[PDB]
């Protein structure tokens, strides 16, 4: 069970953060990777107790070494569901001005996490931001092309994750066709809609009015597509917890379905300074300003590697919730509110 030792903490943290973010802006697409955010905060706590406490740990019960060792081990366990998941995750620190990180900190970070520190010598912010942008692109297989544009900091942390998976039940690109997606009450937009028929894990819940489709990736990855009943998005969002997802996971059963899911890439940024407030940058530097951002990017596509029951049609053609998890570590790989895939 040790491979799952951080799940309860990490996943409580993930659902609370997600709910907070959806509340702050309910009308936007939200995409984050909680496990990636947990890693980034844990990593910065190497050089800074209020960071770790904010992640959900009580340090009277778990020592510092225990946490960093658990996170190290988790990072190794995560890079293994990659049989059917392209998952470029990492942390880059960019140091502007004449600033150097402590040798102690830089070493601890390389060791327990896989982070990188780069000196940006351009005073001009346009160049600086571009170099920072070229970095993260290269590290994400050409996929995250911009992070900044935007207020220049002296010390910049980028936590990034590109994710893209191969389905156990892939869609046929031939079947993908333009359909209406209903964004809100007045506006429809056209999106490429993927379509397949088959026996697919499905649940129609009543306490929280939604329908769920569970789509497995090849490997240990899995996706919950959650379609709230009409008018019920706020309710379902409030339902989200480790308690609730445990229930759902146990009630999913194969059912013959006609399944319509949009093909899209989504990306989003999250200011880590609202979970990691009042860091002392001087604790990290050998001896001004601070930008710490998490950028997540999900490519959702057809995902291919190479009965006398009437099927039910379920279309994700209006806003929905997308939760990606690792079945092995119980990690939250991504949580999303998909409001508009066009
Ligand atoms: C709440 C739960 C169990 C207790 C825990 O500390 C953390 C979690 C979060 C992730 C959950 C997990 C289990 O319920 C099994 C789940 C649902 C997993 C995500 C995907 C899962 O592995 C399955 O889909 C199993 O079919």
From Swiss-Prot:
The record marks 210 as: Conserved cysteine within steroid binding domain. It comes from the Eukaryota. Changing residue 214 to A: Loss of corticosteroid binding. The keyword rRNA processing does not apply. Changing residue 246 to A: Loss of corticosteroid binding. Coiled coil: none annotated. One of its GO terms (biological process) is glucocorticoid metabolic process. It is found in: Secreted. Cortisol binds at residues 214, 246, 330. Glycans are attached at residues 58, 184, 220, 287. Changing residue 4 to A: Loss of corticosteroid binding. SMART domains: SERPIN. One of its GO terms (molecular function) is serine-type endopeptidase inhibitor activity. GO terms for cellular component: extracellular space. Keywords: Glycoprotein, Lipid-binding, Secreted, Signal, Steroid-binding, Transport. Pfam families: Serpin. The keyword Signal applies. Expressed by the liver; secreted in plasma. Proteolytic cleavage leads to an important conformation change. This reduces the affinity for steroids. Belongs to the serpin family. Major transport protein for glucocorticoids and progestins in the blood of almost all vertebrate species. This is Corticosteroid-binding globulin.
């Amino acid at each position: 069970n040790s491979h799952r030792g951080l799940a309860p903490t990490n996943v409580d943290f993930a659902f609370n953060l997600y709910q907070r973010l959806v509340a702050l802006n309910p009308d936007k697409n939200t995409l984050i990777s909680p496990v990636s955010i947990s890693m980034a905060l844990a990593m910065v706590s190497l050089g800074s107790t209020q960071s770790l406490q904010s992640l959900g740990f009580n340090l009277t019960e778990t020592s510092e070494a225990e946490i960093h060792q658990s996170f190290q081990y988790l990072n190794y366990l995560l890079k293994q569901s990659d049989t059917g998941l392209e998952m470029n995750m990492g942390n880059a620190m960019f140091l502007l001005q004449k600033l150097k990180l402590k040798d102690s900190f830089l070493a601890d970070v390389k060791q327990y996490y896989e982070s990188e520190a780069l000196a940006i010598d351009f005073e001009d912010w346009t160049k600086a931001s571009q170099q920072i942008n070229q970095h993260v692109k290269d590290k994400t297989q050409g996929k995250i092309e911009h992070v900044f544009s935007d207020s220049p900091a002296s010390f910049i942390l980028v936590n990034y994750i590109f994710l893209r998976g191969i389905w156990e039940l892939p869609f046929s690109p031939e079947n993908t066709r333009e359909e209406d997606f209903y964004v809100n009450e007045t506006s429809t937009v056209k999106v490429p809609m993927m379509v397949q028929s088959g026996s697919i894990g499905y649940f129609r819940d009543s306490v929280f009015p939604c329908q769920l489709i569970q789509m497995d990736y090849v490997g240990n990855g899995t996706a919950f597509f959650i379609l709230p009943d009409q008018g019920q998005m706020d309710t379902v969002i409030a339902a989200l917890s480790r308690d609730t997802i445990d229930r759902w996971g146990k009630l999913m059963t194969p059912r013959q379905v006609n399944l319509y899911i949009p093909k899209f890439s989504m990306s989003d940024t999250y200011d880590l300074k609202d979970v990691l407030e009042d860091l002392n940058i001087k604790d990290l530097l050998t001896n001004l300003t601070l930008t710490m951002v998490h950028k997540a990017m999900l490519q959702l596509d057809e995902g291919n590697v190479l009965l006398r029951s009437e099927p039910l049609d379920i279309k994700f053609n209006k806003p929905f919730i997308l939760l990606l998890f690792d079945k092995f570590t119980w990690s939250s790989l991504m949580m999303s509110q998909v409001v508009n895939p066009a």
